[PDB]
């Protein structure tokens, strides 16, 4: 929108990370208050800072706002775990004649314990060939959403059709699992000799190949 | 107070929606009521707002005629009309409260927010889902464990409850979400972990219930004989 | 380069008088002689600065405050004037050093059936400082009875609706009123002529 | 702190009532120019919204007390806002009352008379019965028309009129008033201002004291017209008795101008008439309104809005649609002003247009005042203001100044007498009827007369006060006073009595302010800017100030008087005195044409 924010800000636990909103002269430089909004992931947004310097009830003292000239600033004195959110600045505009929000600022607190990705390849069964469709699945477990790139190959050329990436879901042991899909045809299923699933994660690559015949 | 919104429905190109809002304990007065949607990953912008007592609404520039917003103060509610539904109109809508003030600036700030109504537009037609079994091969069962499950094809919408032996299995079960395809088709996956000693005495079946389609298929899984 | 002024005056929807559209003009050259030579406005009164010698002088920043009022409160927009709109919506200070422009727009801010799109503030607990906006919709408590947000006895809403219609007289027709304010603070000049 | 709550409530009422009144006036103007069923539906729904809003706002106002506010204007607004009327009773009684009023309206509007030769041929009341009553030279025909009109409506209205009277009396008794006459007379009461109080009995005593002064001017005119009808009809009226009932020009005896041609004293000198002068010069309503605007702006009064000049009608477009051919003005508010004026190339239409222009100028005078500071404490100020300008525009000097009348027309001692007689035939002649009707209605609403002597008292007071004989006795089965337009739709009639003196008081004030020491009938108020400004200073006030002060700051009198009325017709009074040197002056109450 007209109000510009950084796409994301790195998070240092226990230090200050300043989130800015450099708007135009008709929205922030005009004199309208810059209301700072914070939305938790999978949660409805709520009012974080209002009146451009004042704090609503139920808001921690760590979040404080300040605007000078045509730019606003959000001060975060303390960085804890639940500060993972996207921050929006909202101000009234004269040319637009209405309240407009910003682009969002993803405050990402650091953390990364992981392990090697374990993948399993399940070949299609016999009864699926009579449905005039061929499906190839790639079950991957004990991995992280970072570096979830999935590649397909048939020992002669990579496959650039029917490949998608699915967002993983949280398990009950602080783990995430996902899968990738591939739509094909049983007519060309027997033409290729073998099929393999390629997953790249932090430079660790594992290969699994199934044999239809 | 708390604001209650409707559930999620799928929609079609054209047509209209009737997103509503309801404030618990009354207090739907002396305060403007604005509607803000949350686009899926591209931000939020303001549809419009009504001063409910005066019965006069205002709109934005990109949504002045496409969107119509109405209020009813007797039952403490507001009805949102959104005609001409396309693909970029798929988002989640929130009914936010307004807290006007006399501060020099005096900018509109949203104090209270609703639950959120997810509206999506899809051209998928209702059809019959197809379920096929999956069984591991000889090389897959290197150890004492085996992996098998059931997959769903040609199904809509995405809410589907997959139960193992009518809920008799609770350990090792995992549910996977779908992903957008070229033709707008969705497909999920489901796997379980079982020992190899129970593959010759106990069979595994999948029970899939589809409430809108009024169908329920019972299918068996039998391990591969060639490998 | 020319300051953006055409889209301010040719705006499709001017803001209401309780929440007026405020714009900042800077870092360009603004020829105020175009507005005077066009003479398309009924009101061109400018206190605090001469109606002609403001063009060649250099200022720092310009504030534009646009709103729509009826006919007989154009007189109310002046330093020292009081009223239900000139005090409760936009109180022009006694040391005003700019100009106020008002023109008739009955063909664009009114239609048949009654145009209620423009609002105004009617009741306030006290006065307002100059250059202050009040968008508070909290019910004005008249008497000692606290209604706690329920409309009733000794409780009336501050914000009412206007009566803009194209078949009314010039005293109740929608007039688009903009306010230009010049600040001469300890800053270098950015706008000239 | 009560008074500031009252001011806030009054401001809220002013804004919302201005909006709703503009909407209802818009609906009414849409109906009266484009008559169709959905226009009637628009009037009905707009009136229902207006009535409901007024009802609930008046309840909220009546909830407030009245003994802690000394603010005069606030007190006046509260008094004029705390009004219930027929809503003080139950729902069934109010529905019965307004159903009775609707039956009054329907029976009065649906008035037809059929010839005895064949029942198919019938003539309505407004389009034609008034025409044949105005243009008739026969005694038997007018007698038959009177009998056919008042022998079939009274029989169906008499118990209905009794029900209306008793319902109005009950509603007046339920509103802390002794009678409906007291409720109507309370509109002139002033409360709060010291030294300017006005009760309901002093008005009656002053009306009687002015009526005993208008009696010598009325009995001479009665003797003159009796002599004229004797000369025209020797075997139909004797100059010992009273005037015939149906020989009063019009049907109700209000305007006697229908027999002006029969009662011309000097037929040799041509009467003033510029109808050919506007016919041969291609004069339309546009030119008439332009010259009237020039005359109104030449005396200091501000001119009309463009709204009147573009939105209001002044001509009907053929027979493709029907419009109301009746003068009625609307103050729509918010600077919107409109008027129905059925224009033809005549002089009566010219005077009616000037009267309605005076009406809308008075409406524009108190433009800045709120809806509770609207038109004044009486409904005769506007009539007087319109008619004084109408008569000023009809003076021979005004006609000669605009180039209409030829300057060679002399002003001798005969044309002025004819003009004075014409003015008194429509101004003086309605005062006894107005006073009689108001006094009679007062005693009916007070209850001093039983239900078996209403006709007896009405005809006894008709044979004495007005002095009109009846060609045939009538029993109690009829209701003749229930055949008036102002009595069948619930409007007061004392307004005409007040404006009859108000017009002459205003005319004398303007002629004195214009420094005109000559005769009053030749006085002209053109070119007078100071008199126009002085008049506008009172026109702007409206009902915010008492009518006593509004008369004191104009004519210098707190109470009305017949001094300008007697001074205006002084040459006519002397002419009636010296011409009636051999004719009997007065009338006898023991004369009856059916007893011969
Ligand atoms: C008058 O009423 C008729 C009814 O159909 C409508 O067609 C016409 O447009 C109206 N004209 C005006 C000037 O309101
Ligand atoms: C009635 O109150 C208003 C508002 O305070 C005041 O202006 C006015 O003068 C008062 N009326 C009189 C007769 O003093
Ligand atoms: C005022 O006096 C002038 C003097 O000649 C005259 O022409 C004009 O008609 C007068 N005004 C009116 C309204 O008669
Ligand atoms: C009223 O008279 C003034 C001059 O006194 C004139 O300028 C104005 O145009 C007139 N109004 C109209 C509607 O013609
Ligand atoms: Zn009249």
Is D486 a residue of the active site?
yes
Which tokens in the block code for residue B108?
Answer: 């509109």
How many Cα atoms within 13 Å fall on the side-chain side of residue D596? Answer: 9
DSSP D186: G
DSSP D80: H
Question: A29 contacts in C (CB within 8 Å)?
Answer: 24
Long-range CB contacts (within 8 A, 24+) of D239-242:
D239/D583, D239/D584, D240/D584, D240/D588, D240/D591, D241/D469, D241/D587, D241/D588, D241/D591, D241/D592, D241/D593, D242/D463, D242/D467, D242/D468, D242/D469, D242/D587, D242/D588, D242/D589, D242/D591
Rounded to the nearest 5°, which phi and psi values hold at A99?
-75, 135
Q: How far apart are CA A64 and CA A74, in angstroms?
A: 6
Q: Does A212 contact B at CB distance below 8 Å?
A: no
Q: How far apart are CA D26 and CA C93, in angstroms?
A: 40
Neighbours of chain D (3+ CB pairs under 8 A): C
Selected catalytic residue, list D220, D222, D354, D356:
D356
Going by C-alpha positions, the residue among D146, D117, D116 that lies closest to residue D129 is D146
Residues in chain A, overall count: 213
Going by C-alpha positions, the residue among A148, A123, A5 that lies closest to residue A71 is A5
Q: Does A129 contact B at CB distance below 8 Å?
A: no
B57, B102, B111, best to mutate vs chain C, most C CBs in 10 Å: B102
Find residues 104-163 of chain B whose CB sits inside 8 Å of chain A: 104-111, 113-116, 130, 132-137, 140, 147, 151, 153
Instruction: Please indicate whether residue D321, judged by its CB atom, sits closer than 6 Å to ligand 1.
Output: no
Question: A28 contacts in C (CB within 8 Å)?
Answer: none
**C-alpha Rg value of chain B to the nearest Å:** 25
Resolution attained, angstroms:
4.0
Contact check, Cβ <8 Å, C163/D23 = no
Residue whose entry in the numeric block shows the structure tokens 């009266």: D32
Going by C-alpha positions, the residue among B103, B105, B182, B197 that lies closest to residue B144 is B197
Q: What is the CATH number of the domain that holds C40?
A: 3.30.70.1840
Number of Cβ pairs closer than 8 Å across A and C?
Answer: 28
Residue whose entry in the numeric block shows the structure tokens 């709703």: D20
DSSP D594: G
Contact check, Cβ <8 Å, C139/B105 = no
Selected catalytic residue, list D291, D486, D516, D552:
D486
- E strand intervals along A111-155: 118-122, 134-143, 149-153
Q: Are residues A167 and A140 in the same domain?
A: yes
Domain that holds residue C149: 1-193
Q: Does C45 contact B at CB distance below 8 Å?
A: no
> Please, what is the Cα angle at C141 between C139 and C147, to 5 degrees?
75
Is D293 a residue of the active site?
no
Measured between its terminal Cα atoms, the distance across chain C in Å is 11
CB D566 within 8 A of CB D573: yes
Contact check, Cβ <8 Å, A32/C7 = no
Q: Are residues A33 and A95 in the same domain?
A: yes
- For domain B130-221, the CATH class is mainly beta
**Omega cis (within 30) before A121:** no
Q: How far is CA D429 from the centre of its chain?
A: 13
Q: Going by DSSP bridges, is the β-strand pair A204-210/B145-153 parallel, antiparallel, or unpaired?
A: unpaired
Nearest ligand 4 atom to alpha carbon D304? 13
Nearest ligand 3 atom to alpha carbon D398? 14
| Chains C and A physically touch (3 or more Cβ atom pairs below 8 Å) | yes
What residues of D form the annotated binding site for chloride? Answer: 150, 458, 462
| A85 belongs to a structural domain | yes
Rounded to the nearest 5°, which phi and psi values hold at A20?
-110, 160
Residue whose entry in the numeric block shows the structure tokens 């609207």: D374
Q: Going by DSSP bridges, is the β-strand pair B190-195/B174-175 parallel, antiparallel, or unpaired?
A: antiparallel
What residues of D form the annotated binding site? Answer: 150, 254, 326-327, 355, 359, 383, 458, 462, 496
Among B46, B137, B176, the residue with its CB nearest the CB of A100 is B46
Q: Are residues A26 and A93 in the same domain?
A: yes
Nearest ligand 2 atom to alpha carbon D7? 4
Rounded distance from Cα D359 to ligand 5 centre (Å): 7
The count of other CB atoms within 10 Å of the CB of residue D515 is 9
To the nearest whole Å, the CA of C81 is away from the closest chain D CA by: 17
Residues in chain D, overall count: 596
Q: How far apart are CA B114 and CA D179, in angstroms?
A: 62
CB B166 within 8 A of CB B207: yes
Q: How far apart are CA C66 and CA C53, in angstroms?
A: 23
Q: Does C117 contact A at CB distance below 8 Å?
A: no
- The domain tally of chain A equals 2
Question: D367 contacts in C (CB within 8 Å)?
Answer: 171
DSSP D462: I
H or E element in which residue B216 lies = strand B215-221
User: Ligand 2, from D10, D69, D74, D543: best to mutate by most atoms within 8 Å of Cβ?
Assistant: D74
How many H-runs (helices) and E-runs (strands) does chain D carry?
Answer: 23, 4
What's the CATH fold of domain B2-121?
Immunoglobulin-like (2.60.40)
| A113 belongs to a structural domain | no
Which tokens in the block code for residue C191?
Answer: 């706008």
Rounded distance from Cα D556 to ligand 3 centre (Å): 29
Q: What is the CATH number of the domain that holds A186?
A: 2.60.40.10
Going by C-alpha positions, the residue among B184, B204, B208 that lies closest to residue B194 is B204
Rounded distance from Cα D297 to ligand 4 centre (Å): 8
Domain that holds residue A22: 8-108
| A87 belongs to a structural domain | yes
Measured between its terminal Cα atoms, the distance across chain D in Å is 76
A1, A8, A28, A45, best to mutate vs chain B, most B CBs in 10 Å: A45
Q: Are residues A18 and A43 in the same domain?
A: yes
Q: Are residues A99 and A126 in the same domain?
A: no
How many Cα atoms within 13 Å fall on the side-chain side of residue B108? Answer: 26
Experimental method: cryo-EM
Going by C-alpha positions, the residue among D205, D200, D177 that lies closest to residue D190 is D200
Nearest ligand 2 atom to alpha carbon D71? 1
Contact residues of ligand 2, CB 6 A cut-off: D 71-74
Q: How far is CA D488 from the centre of its chain?
A: 15
Residue A144 CA: distances (Å) to CA of A140, A180, A182, A205, B172: 10, 14, 21, 14, 19
Residue whose entry in the numeric block shows the structure tokens 């803001």: C15
Q: Does D33 contact C at CB distance below 8 Å?
A: no
Strands lying side by side in the sheet with A134-143: A118-122, A134-143, A176-184, A169-170
Domains of chain B by residue range: 2-121, 130-221
**Atom 10 (ligand 4): residue with closest C-alpha?**
D303
Among C119, C131, C137, the residue with its CB nearest the CB of B30 is C137
- The domain tally of chain C equals 1
Residues in chain B, overall count: 227
Strand partners, A137: A122, A181
Q: Is A162 exposed, middle or buried (0-12, 13-18, 19+ CB in 10 A)?
A: middle
DSSP C109: S
Which tokens in the block code for residue D36?
Answer: 């169709």
Sign of CA dihedral A97, C189, C79, D5: positive
Among A25, A92, A97, the residue with its CB nearest the CB of C24 is A25
Domain boundary among A87, A108, A129: A108
Give CA torsion, residues D159, D165, D171, D175, to 10 deg. -170
- E strand intervals along chain C: 21-25, 28-29, 61-69, 98-104, 119-121, 140-141, 155-156, 159-161, 175-183, 191-192
Rounded distance from Cα D34 to ligand 1 centre (Å): 6
- What does the DSSP assignment read for D92-119? HHHHHHHHHHHHHHHHHHS-EEE-SS-S
Measured between its terminal Cα atoms, the distance across chain A in Å is 56
Domain boundary among A55, A82, A108: A108
Nearest ligand 4 atom to alpha carbon D305? 13
Question: C143 contacts in D (CB within 8 Å)?
Answer: 1, 5
Q: How far apart are CA C123 and CA C142, in angstroms?
A: 9
| Three-state DSSP state, C3 | coil
| Chains D and B physically touch (3 or more Cβ atom pairs below 8 Å) | no
Q: Going by DSSP bridges, is the β-strand pair A8-11/A106-109 parallel, antiparallel, or unpaired?
A: parallel
């Amino acid at each position: 929108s007209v109000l510009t924010q950084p796409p994301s800000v790195s998070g240092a636990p226990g230090q200050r990370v300043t989130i800015s909103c450099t708007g135009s002269s008709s929205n922030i430089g005009a004199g309208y208050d810059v209301h700072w909004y914070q939305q938790l992931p999978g949660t409805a947004p709520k009012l974080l800072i209002y009146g451009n310097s004042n704090r609503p009830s139920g808001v921690p003292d760590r979040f404080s706002g300040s605007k000078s000239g045509t730019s606003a600033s959000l001060a975060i004195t303390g960085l804890q775990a639940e500060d993972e959110a996207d921050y929006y600045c909202q101000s009234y505009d004269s040319s637009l004649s209405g309240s407009v929000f910003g682009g969002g600022t993803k405050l990402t607190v650091l953390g990364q314990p992981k392990a090697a990705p374990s993948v399993t390849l399940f070949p299609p069964s016999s009864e699926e060939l009579q449905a005039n469709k061929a499906t190839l699945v790639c079950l991957i477990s004990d991995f992280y959403p970072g570096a979830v790139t999935v590649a397909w190959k048939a020992d002669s050329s990579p496959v650039k059709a029917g490949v998608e990436t699915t967002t993983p879901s949280k398990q009950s042991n602080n783990k995430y699992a996902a899968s990738s899909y591939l739509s094909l045809t049983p007519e060309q299923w027997k033409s290729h000799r073998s099929y393999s699933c390629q997953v790249t994660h932090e430079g660790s690559t594992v290969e699994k190949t199934v044999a239809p015949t | 107070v708390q604001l209650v919104e409707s559930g999620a429905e799928v929609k079609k190109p054209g047509s209209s929606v009737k997103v509503s809002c309801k404030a618990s304990g009354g207090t739907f007065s002396s305060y403007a009521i604005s509607w803000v949607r949350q686009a899926p990953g591209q931000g939020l912008e303001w549809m419009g707002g009504i001063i409910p007592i005066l019965g006069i609404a205002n709109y934005a520039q990109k949504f002045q005629g496409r969107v119509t917003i109405t209020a009813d103060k007797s039952t403490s509610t507001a009805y949102m009309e959104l005609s001409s539904l396309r693909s970029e109109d798929t988002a989640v809508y929130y009914c936010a409260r307004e807290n006007g003030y006399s501060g020099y600036g005096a900018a509109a700030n949203f104090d209270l927010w609703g639950r959120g109504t997810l509206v999506t537009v899809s051209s998928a037609s209702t059809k019959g889902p197809s379920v096929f079994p999956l069984a591991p091969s000889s090389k897959s069962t290197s150890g004492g464990t085996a992996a098998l499950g059931c997959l769903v094809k040609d199904y809509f919408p995405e809410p589907v409850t997959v139960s193992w032996n009518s809920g008799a299995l609770t350990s090792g079960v995992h549910t996977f979400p779908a992903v957008l395809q070229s033709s707008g088709l969705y497909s999920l996956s489901s796997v379980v972990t079982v020992p190899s000693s129970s593959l010759g005495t106990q069979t595994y079946i999948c029970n899939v219930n589809h409430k809108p389609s009024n169908t329920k298929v019972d299918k068996k899984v039998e391990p591969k004989s060639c490998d | 380069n020319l300051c953006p002024f055409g889209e301010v005056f040719n705006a499709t929807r001017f803001a209401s008088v309780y929440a007026w559209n405020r714009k900042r003009i800077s870092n360009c050259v603004a020829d105020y002689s175009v507005l005077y030579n066009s003479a398309s406005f009924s009101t061109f009164k400018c206190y605090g600065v001469s109606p002609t010698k403001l063009n060649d002088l250099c200022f720092t920043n310009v504030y534009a405050d646009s709103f729509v009022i009826r006919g007989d409160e154009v007189r109310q927009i002046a330093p020292g004037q009081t009223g239900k709109i000139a005090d409760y919506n936009y109180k022009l200070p006694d040391d005003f050093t700019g100009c106020v422009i008002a023109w008739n727009s009955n063909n664009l801010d009114s239609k048949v059936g009654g145009n209620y799109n423009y609002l105004y503030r009617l009741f306030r607990k006290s006065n307002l400082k100059p250059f202050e906006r009040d968008i508070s919709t909290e019910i004005y408590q008249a008497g000692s009875t606290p209604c706690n947000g329920v409309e009733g006895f000794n409780c009336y809403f501050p914000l009412q609706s206007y009566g803009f219609q194209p078949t009314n007289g010039v005293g109740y027709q929608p007039y688009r009123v903009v306010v230009l304010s010049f600040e001469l603070l300890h800053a270098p000049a950015t706008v000239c002529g | 702190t009560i008074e500031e709550q009252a001011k806030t409530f009054l401001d809220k009422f002013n804004h919302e009532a201005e909006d709703l009144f503009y909407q209802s006036s818009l609906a009414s103007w849409n109906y009266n120019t484009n008559i169709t069923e959905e226009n009637v539906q628009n009037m009905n729904n707009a009136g229902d919204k207006w009535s409901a809003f007024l009802k609930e706002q008046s309840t909220l106002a009546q909830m407030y007390p009245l003994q802690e506010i000394q603010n005069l204007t606030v007190k006046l607004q509260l008094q004029a806002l705390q009004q219930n009327g027929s809503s003080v009773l139950s729902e069934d009684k109010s529905k019965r009352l307004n159903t009775i009023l609707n039956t009054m309206s329907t029976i009065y509007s649906t008035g037809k008379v059929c010839n005895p030769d064949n029942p198919q041929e019938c003539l309505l009341l407004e389009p034609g019965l008034n025409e044949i009553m105005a243009n008739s030279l026969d005694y038997n025909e007018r007698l038959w028309a009177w009998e056919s009109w008042r022998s079939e409506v009274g029989k169906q209205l008499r118990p209905l009129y009794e029900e209306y009277v008793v319902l109005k009396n009950e509603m007046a008794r339920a509103n802390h008033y002794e009678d409906y006459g007291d409720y109507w007379r309370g509109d002139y009461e002033v409360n709060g201002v010291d030294g300017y109080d006005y009760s309901r009995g002093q008005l009656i005593e002053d009306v009687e004291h002015t009526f005993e002064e208008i009696k010598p001017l009325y009995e001479h005119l009665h003797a003159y017209v009796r002599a004229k009808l004797m000369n025209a009809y020797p075997s139909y009226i004797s100059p010992i008795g009273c005037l015939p009932a149906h020989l009063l020009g019009d049907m109700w005896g209000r305007f006697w101008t229908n027999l002006y041609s029969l009662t011309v004293p000097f037929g040799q000198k041509p009467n003033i008439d510029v109808t050919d002068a506007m016919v041969d010069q291609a004069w339309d309503a546009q030119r008439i309104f332009k010259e009237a605007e020039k005359f109104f702006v030449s005396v200091g009064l501000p001119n009309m809005t463009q709204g009147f000049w573009e939105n209001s009608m002044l001509t009907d477009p053929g027979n493709v649609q029907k419009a109301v051919c009746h003068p009625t003005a609307w103050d729509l508010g918010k600077g919107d002003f409109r008027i129905l004026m059925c224009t033809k190339v005549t002089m009566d239409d010219f005077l009616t247009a000037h009267h309605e222009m005076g009406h809308i100028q008075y409406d524009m005078a108190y433009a800045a005042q709120p809806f509770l500071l609207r038109n004044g404490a009486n409904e005769g100020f506007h009539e007087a203001v319109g008619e004084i300008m109408s008569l000023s525009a009809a003076t021979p000097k005004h006609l000669k100044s605009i180039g209409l009348l030829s300057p060679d027309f002399q002003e001798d001692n005969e044309t002025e007498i004819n003009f004075l007689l014409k003015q008194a035939l429509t101004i003086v002649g309605t005062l006894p009827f107005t006073y009689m009707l108001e006094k009679w209605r007062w005693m009916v609403f007070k209850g001093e007369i039983p239900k078996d002597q209403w006709m007896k008292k009405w005809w006894e007071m008709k044979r004495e006060i007005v002095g009109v004989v009846e060609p045939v006795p009538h029993d109690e089965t009829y209701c003749d006073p229930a055949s008036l337009f102002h009595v069948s739709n619930d409007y007061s009639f004392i307004r005409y009595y007040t404006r009859t003196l108000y017009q002459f008081q205003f005319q004398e004030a303007l002629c004195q302010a214009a420094k005109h020491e000559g005769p009053l009938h030749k006085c002209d108020i053109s070119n007078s800017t100071e008199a126009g400004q002085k008049l506008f200073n009172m026109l702007r006030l409206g009902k915010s100030e008492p009518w006593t002060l509004a008369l004191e700051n104009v004519v210098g009198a707190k109470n009305m008087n017949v001094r300008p009325l007697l001074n205006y017709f002084e040459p006519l009074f002397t002419w009636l005195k010296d011409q009636n040197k051999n004719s009997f002056v007065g009338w006898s109450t023991d004369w009856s044409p059916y007893a011969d």
